[PDB]
Scaffold this active site. Structure first.
Site, PDB file in Angstrom:
ATOM      1  N   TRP A  18      40.775  35.558  30.914  1.00  0.00           N
ATOM      2  CA  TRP A  18      40.413  34.478  32.229  1.00  0.00           C
ATOM      3  C   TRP A  18      38.968  34.373  32.136  1.00  0.00           C
ATOM      4  CZ3 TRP A  18      43.257  34.222  37.427  1.00  0.00           C
ATOM      5  CH2 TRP A  18      42.686  33.401  38.099  1.00  0.00           C
ATOM      6  N   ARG A  78      50.082  32.879  32.678  1.00  0.00           N
ATOM      7  CA  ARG A  78      49.867  32.625  31.376  1.00  0.00           C
ATOM      8  C   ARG A  78      51.054  33.387  30.395  1.00  0.00           C
ATOM      9  NH1 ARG A  78      44.351  35.333  31.727  1.00  0.00           N
ATOM     10  NH2 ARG A  78      45.514  36.358  33.769  1.00  0.00           N
ATOM     11  N   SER A  93      42.092  45.689  28.792  1.00  0.00           N
ATOM     12  CA  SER A  93      41.115  44.589  28.866  1.00  0.00           C
ATOM     13  C   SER A  93      39.903  44.798  29.544  1.00  0.00           C
ATOM     14  CB  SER A  93      41.633  43.155  29.319  1.00  0.00           C
ATOM     15  OG  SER A  93      41.178  42.196  28.305  1.00  0.00           O
ATOM     16  N   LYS A 143      37.707  40.228  22.492  1.00  0.00           N
ATOM     17  CA  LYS A 143      37.753  41.588  22.071  1.00  0.00           C
ATOM     18  C   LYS A 143      38.461  41.850  20.728  1.00  0.00           C
ATOM     19  CE  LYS A 143      38.227  43.883  26.430  1.00  0.00           C
ATOM     20  NZ  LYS A 143      37.995  42.828  27.542  1.00  0.00           N
ATOM     21  N   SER A 168      45.690  38.090  26.475  1.00  0.00           N
ATOM     22  CA  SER A 168      45.316  37.296  27.574  1.00  0.00           C
ATOM     23  C   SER A 168      43.749  37.055  27.795  1.00  0.00           C
ATOM     24  CB  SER A 168      45.959  37.826  28.895  1.00  0.00           C
ATOM     25  OG  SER A 168      45.339  38.761  29.428  1.00  0.00           O
ATOM     26  N   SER A 209      37.863  37.056  27.215  1.00  0.00           N
ATOM     27  CA  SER A 209      38.524  38.471  26.730  1.00  0.00           C
ATOM     28  C   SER A 209      39.075  38.359  25.558  1.00  0.00           C
ATOM     29  CB  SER A 209      39.375  39.209  27.938  1.00  0.00           C
ATOM     30  OG  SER A 209      38.510  39.316  29.100  1.00  0.00           O
TER      31      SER A 209
HETATM   32  C1  LIG Z   1      38.865  38.231  30.239  1.00  0.00           C
HETATM   33  O1  LIG Z   1      38.878  37.227  29.653  1.00  0.00           O
HETATM   34  C2  LIG Z   1      38.398  38.565  31.588  1.00  0.00           C
HETATM   35  C3  LIG Z   1      37.048  38.776  31.997  1.00  0.00           C
HETATM   36  C4  LIG Z   1      36.778  39.739  32.909  1.00  0.00           C
HETATM   37  O2  LIG Z   1      36.669  39.219  30.560  1.00  0.00           O
HETATM   38  C5  LIG Z   1      39.795  39.481  32.334  1.00  0.00           C
HETATM   39  C6  LIG Z   1      39.615  40.965  31.692  1.00  0.00           C
HETATM   40  C7  LIG Z   1      39.999  39.343  33.769  1.00  0.00           C
HETATM   41  C8  LIG Z   1      41.477  38.905  33.902  1.00  0.00           C
HETATM   42  S1  LIG Z   1      41.977  38.728  35.353  1.00  0.00           S
HETATM   43  C9  LIG Z   1      43.052  40.093  35.900  1.00  0.00           C
HETATM   44  C10 LIG Z   1      42.267  41.284  35.065  1.00  0.00           C
HETATM   45  N1  LIG Z   1      43.377  41.990  34.403  1.00  0.00           N
HETATM   46  C11 LIG Z   1      44.790  41.637  35.135  1.00  0.00           C
HETATM   47  C12 LIG Z   1      45.999  41.767  34.205  1.00  0.00           C
HETATM   48  O3  LIG Z   1      45.530  41.607  32.932  1.00  0.00           O
HETATM   49  N2  LIG Z   1      47.004  42.014  34.618  1.00  0.00           N
HETATM   50  C13 LIG Z   1      48.235  42.099  33.976  1.00  0.00           C
HETATM   51  C14 LIG Z   1      47.299  42.271  36.033  1.00  0.00           C
HETATM   52  C15 LIG Z   1      44.379  40.390  35.653  1.00  0.00           C
HETATM   53  C16 LIG Z   1      41.933  38.709  32.804  1.00  0.00           C
HETATM   54  C17 LIG Z   1      43.216  38.128  32.343  1.00  0.00           C
HETATM   55  O4  LIG Z   1      43.520  37.442  31.283  1.00  0.00           O
HETATM   56  O5  LIG Z   1      44.232  38.233  33.359  1.00  0.00           O
HETATM   57  N3  LIG Z   1      40.993  38.702  31.924  1.00  0.00           N
END
Ligand SMILES: *C(=O)[C@H]([C@@H](C)O)[C@@]1(C)CC(S[C@@H]2CN[C@H](C(=O)N(C)C)C2)=C(C(=O)O)N1
Length: 243
Positions: free
Chosen positions: A186, A226, A93, A49, A184, A46
């Protein structure tokens, strides 16, 4: 010094291969438990982006005022089943908003733009809305840190006002006159899974410290680690003190 020890002491409790890179415009500094990660290339997940919004605003495929409407087919998170501006999706995100953006750009322009700026290994493969989620695009923590340093400076190869718009989509919080910007990531679609926390602190002295946490992830991990780790490091560094 003693703050290097304080920073590295934080990583002595982390049970994950991790590296944290800083770039102040002259010196790359590296901290963590697996320093070789800083030179290793991983999917941006992500964090792409950032470059996706830049390319798309630069090439007239979206604006930061345009609404990306929800097409009704439900989304992975139920916080995604809404309409979003590009900025609102950057901080939520929201992946499908930014895949729609990449489809708007197209594989030809996406490839040539990534070559033009030199982003990572500049590889996109055949799926124009998947390359940052599963490869072949890869980027090192050191590349991510320089990239976002130049964005903070307005010195990327983009119209000055496009950089400024993508910059403010990243804005997190301020302490006195110091401003944190971060994104961030993941990447679960790869083995190992890769965690990102990339950003920069803009100080009152017109100065910037860019940063990139990069670590290995496993299903079940604390999603909040993170950011909480990177903010701990920044405070031990004195770059972004706790208030
Ligand atoms: C991005 O890298 C990743 C994938 C789907 O592109 C993504 C959007 C999933 C997650 S885990 C989860 C989604 N959003 C939550 C968040 O940010 N918070 C604060 C609760 C966690 C992430 C991530 O970086 O956490 N990115």
């Amino acid at each position: 010094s003693i703050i290097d020890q304080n920073v590295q002491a934080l990583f002595n409790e982390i049970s994950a291969d991790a590296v944290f890179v800083t770039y102040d415009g002259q010196n790359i500094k590296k901290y963590g438990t697996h320093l070789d990660r800083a030179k290793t290339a991983y999917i941006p997940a992500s964090t792409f982006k950032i470059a996706n919004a830049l390319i798309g605003l630069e090439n007239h495929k979206a604006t930061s005022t345009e609404i990306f409407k929800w097409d009704g087919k439900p989304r992975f998170f139920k916080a995604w089943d809404k309409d979003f501006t590009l900025g609102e999706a950057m901080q939520a995100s929201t992946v499908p908003v930014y895949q729609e953006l990449a489809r708007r750009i197209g594989p030809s322009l996406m490839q040539s733009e990534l070559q033009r700026i030199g982003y990572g290994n500049m590889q996109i493969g055949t799926e124009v809305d998947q390359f940052w989620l599963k490869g072949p695009l890869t980027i090192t923590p050191i590349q991510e840190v320089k990239f976002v340093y130049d964005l903070a400076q307005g010195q990327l190869p983009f119209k000055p006002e496009v950089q400024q718009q993508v910059k403010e989509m990243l804005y997190v919080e301020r302490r006195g006159e110091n401003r944190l910007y971060a994104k961030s990531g993941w990447g679960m679609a790869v083995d190992p899974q890769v965690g990102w926390y990339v950003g920069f602190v803009e100080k009152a002295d017109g100065q910037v410290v860019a940063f990139a946490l990069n670590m290995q992830m496993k299903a079940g991990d604390d999603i909040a680690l993170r950011k909480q780790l990177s903010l701990d490091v920044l405070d031990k560094l004195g770059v972004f003190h706790y208030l």
